Amino acid sequence: HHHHFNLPPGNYKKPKLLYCTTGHFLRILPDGTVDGTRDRSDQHIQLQLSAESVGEVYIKSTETGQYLAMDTDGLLYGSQTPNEECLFLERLEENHYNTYISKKHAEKNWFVGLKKNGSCKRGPRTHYGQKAILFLPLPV
């Protein structure tokens, strides 16, 4: 899809915590809100990734079943059902971190990203080079 294909190591057999280098874990709340928390004990940060195609993943809350998705204006939200806004290109970055580019808006490099204050970044505001788009997956 007009993007590199360096993929991060690891399988999808188990759920993961996605820690953003900006200091928060990615969280999908029951009401569909998406944000970040520093609390590892939070029950809405356990995420199950799955590959629909090599390098293309869904990111789902194991607690609520919601799928991470990015809307037409770049906002992350939790979707009850899988749609084209729920697919992300999972890639390696700096030979180490995991990044996620909205497949639907891949042409504009809209990434999944969290700000240091724990709020999500809007697609257009993200870009290569930011700490906000870098994730370090951890075991649950």
UniProtKB/Swiss-Prot annotation:
Residues recorded as binding heparin, renumbered to this chain, are: 22
Give the encoding gene's name: FGF1
Similarity comment? Belongs to the heparin-binding growth factors family.
Where is it expressed, tissue-wise?
Predominantly expressed in kidney and brain. Detected at much lower levels in heart and skeletal muscle.
Output the Gene Ontology terms for molecular function. fibroblast growth factor receptor binding; growth factor activity; heparin binding; integrin binding; S100 protein binding
Which effect does the record note for changing residue 119 to E? Decrease in LRRC59-binding
Cellular component, GO annotation = cell cortex; cytoplasm; cytosol; extracellular matrix; extracellular region; extracellular space; nucleoplasm; nucleus
PANTHER family registered for this protein in UniProt: FIBROBLAST GROWTH FACTOR (PTHR11486)
Q: Where is this region: Heparin-binding?
A: 115-131
Q: Which InterPro entries match?
A: Fibroblast_GF_fam, IL1/FGF
Query: Which residue ranges run through the membrane?
Result: none
What is the designated name of this protein? Fibroblast growth factor 1
Q: Keywords assigned by UniProt?
A: Acetylation, Angiogenesis, Cytoplasm, Developmental protein, Differentiation, Growth factor, Heparin-binding, Mitogen, Nucleus, Phosphoprotein, Secreted
Q: Where is this motif: Nuclear localization signal?
A: 13-16
* Any GO BP annotation: fibroblast growth factor receptor signaling pathway
